[PDB]
């Protein structure tokens, strides 16, 4: 038998099952040396009875039964992967020539569910051997397979919680209705451990059926790189707070900056003139970040972006984890980086970084694989745990960074109040950002050709969970997309997750 993939609560995510395949002996030759016929006789009346129990027409059942120079015929997709009672029905019909051959099939109970994390195993018709093709299934193929007495494979426990992973798969569906984006992902992560509690992307595939398997081969969380947008200012701001370049009450000149003769300007183009650094961040002033880069100095800001573990794989347990790159080739790359362009990141790299603001400066290496253990021997081949990827900042720094994130959402001047939730205090940072042109080019163009993100955590200050949500190139409501961003996904995902984790406020959301 092949191993099982379990959730954190040992709920099954993938297992082997015995299913059945229809076969009809059409040629007389089977019953020359037999009392009972071993071949189909009333090809019309056997075709009739087989209908209803099979999802084929009594017309096409005969069509496949009246093939010639053929001893033993089958029925494509439609008469394979059949259930145990599906068999007991056809078996009771005591039809001659008709047999049911038991084939073992990999079964994904919730179907399209963390499809890009869990992955999928494909079966070799000849040996019936199952081989992992993506995600957990391919990563651990050796451990799951019992080929690498008939011996049983090893189980693999994920940190996924089916109950959260639900809220996520639902909200993500709601976004492909509203915005039909080219790419989309959410992830929930325990603030205090780096456990991935839920993760899905769009487009994905259904591992049960095999629908749309291929297409997007790449896992968003671990394999796809992004120009992240302003979610990434948070790390610049930390660095500055540490170096002492930032002070919430100190003023700076907003508007634009001329860098290698280019007018990179705040999102209103004009600025708000001389204002406090706090408001600048609350507003998402790109000039602020460029000002702080100047104050701290290019060389130190690369060292800082490296110290937050960018342009270097998080070393998580996924196949070809991407490292991304820090945009620091010339002074423009460097300034554009400050507000999350040029530089490419894995969303996981971001989870790592953001963790440092709640773990008193320490970045938590994110992990989704809890254990690999043969359920016979009980021998933990591998066991996951919370490690520390680095401590780039001090507790002080982190506390200050958090206050600014509180304001981004909960300031009187918040431009991100659409990310608020009834019955819970939320904080985080917003990230509207242009998208790189796939093959050569430069930037995808359009009316709102953006990747909107949010990197929130609740409850604010001492949070339980971080939710990172990203939507690429909304091909519908592309305006609402720019305006509301991933607020339409974040609010449900968080709200339900906090209820499910039993956190309280003023009503106890009964």
By what method was this entry solved?
X-ray
Q: State CA 23 to chain mean position distance.
A: 40
Q: Residue with structure tokens 């007018």?
A: 263
Cβ 98 vs Cβ 91: under 8 Å: no
Question: Does residue 337 carry a catalytic annotation?
Answer: no
Q: Which backbone phi and psi does 131 adopt, to 5 degrees?
A: -125, 130
Q: What is the Cα–Cα distance from 243 to 292, expressed in whole angstroms? A: 10
Domains and CATH numbers, the chain: 13-106 (3.30.70.2110), 162-501 (3.40.710.10)
Cβ 155 vs Cβ 6: under 8 Å: yes
User: Three-class SS string for 379-394?
Assistant: CEEEECCCCEEECCCC
Report how far apart the first and last C-alpha atoms of the chain are (Å, whole number). 44
The CA R_g of the chain, rounded to the nearest whole Å, is: 28
Q: What is the Cα–Cα distance from 111 to 118, expressed in whole angstroms? A: 11
Q: What is the Cα–Cα distance from 464 to 349, expressed in whole angstroms? A: 19
Which of 123, 91, 118 lies closest to 104 in space, CA to CA?
123
To one decimal, the resolution in angstroms is 3.0
E strand or H helix that includes residue 134: strand 130-134
Cβ 364 vs Cβ 352: under 8 Å: yes
Q: What is the Cα–Cα distance from 170 to 167, expressed in whole angstroms? A: 5
Q: Which residues pair with 258 in a beta bridge?
A: 263
Q: What is the Cα–Cα distance from 455 to 308, expressed in whole angstroms? A: 15
* String of DSSP letters for 353-414: HHHTTTTTTPEE--B-EEEEE-TTT--EEEE----EEE--S-HHHHHHHHHHHHHHHHSTT-
Q: Residue with structure tokens 């070809």?
A: 320
Which of 184, 278, 227 lies closest to 431 in space, CA to CA?
227
Angle of helix 298-307 versus helix 331-338 axis, rounded to 10 = 50
- Could you say which of 145, 200, 230, 487 is catalytic? 230
């Amino acid at each position: 038998m092949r191993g099982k993939i379990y959730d954190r609560n040992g709920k099954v995510l993938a297992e082997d099952v015995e299913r059945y395949k229809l076969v009809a002996v059409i040629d007389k030759k089977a019953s020359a040396n037999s009392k009972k016929p071993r071949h189909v006789v009333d090809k019309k009346e056997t075709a009739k009875k087989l209908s209803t129990v099979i999802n084929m027409k009594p017309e096409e059942i005969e069509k496949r039964l009246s093939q010639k120079k053929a001893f033993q015929i089958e029925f494509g997709r439609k008469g394979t992967n059949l259930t145990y009672q599906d068999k007991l029905k056809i078996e009771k019909m005591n039809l001659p020539g008709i047999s049911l051959l038991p084939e073992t099939e990999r079964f994904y109970p919730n179907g399209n569910f963390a499809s890009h994390l869990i992955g999928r195993a494909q079966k070799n018709p000849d040996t019936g051997e199952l081989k992992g093709a993506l995600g957990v299934e391919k990563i651990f193929d050796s451990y799951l397979s019992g080929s690498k007495q008939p011996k049983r494979g090893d189980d693999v426990h994920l940190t996924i919680d089916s109950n959260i992973q639900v809220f996520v798969e639902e909200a993500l569906d709601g976004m492909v209705e509203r915005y039909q984006p080219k790419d989309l992902f959410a992830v929930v992560m325990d603030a205090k451990t780096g456990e991935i509690l839920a993760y899905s992307q769009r487009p994905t595939f259904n591992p049960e059926t095999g629908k749309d398997f291929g297409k997007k081969w790449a896992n968003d969380l671990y394999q796809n790189t992004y120009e992240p947008g302003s979610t990434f200012k948070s790390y610049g701001l930390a660095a500055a707070i540490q170096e002492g370049a930032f002070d919430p009450d100190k003023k700076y000149k907003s508007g634009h900056r001329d860098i290698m003769g280019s007018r990179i300007s705040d999102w209103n183009r004009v600025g708000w003139g001389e204002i406090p650094m706090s408001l600048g961040f609350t507003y998402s002033s790109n000039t602020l970040m460029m000002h702080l880069q100047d104050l701290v100095g290019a060389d130190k800001m690369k060292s800082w972006y490296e110290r937050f573990g960018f342009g270097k794989s998080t070393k998580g347990m996924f196949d070809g984890e991407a490292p991304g790159q820090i945009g620091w080739s010339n002074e423009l790359q460097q300034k554009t980086s400050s507000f999350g362009q040029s530089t490419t990141v894995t969303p996981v790299q971001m989870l790592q970084a953001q963790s440092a603001f709640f773990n008193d400066g320490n970045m938590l290496k994110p992990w989704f694989v809890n254990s690999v253990e043969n359920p016979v021997s009980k021998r933990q081949f591998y066991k996951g745990q919370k490690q520390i990827a680095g401590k780039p900042i001090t507790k002080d720094t982190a506390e200050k960074v958090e206050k600014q994130l509180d304001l981004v959402v909960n300031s009187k001047k918040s431009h991100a109040a659409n990310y608020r939730i009834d019955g819970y205090e939320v904080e985080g940072k917003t990230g509207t950002a242009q998208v790189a042109a796939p093959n050569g080019g430069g930037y995808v163009k359009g009316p709102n050709p953006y990747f909107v993100s949010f990197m929130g955590d609740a409850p604010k200050k001492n949070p339980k969970v971080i939710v990172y949500a990203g939507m690429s190139l909304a091909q519908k409501n592309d305006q609402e997309a720019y305006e509301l961003g991933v607020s339409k996904a974040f609010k449900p995902i968080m709200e339900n997750t906090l209820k499910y984790l039993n956190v309280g406020k003023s009503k106890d959301d009964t």
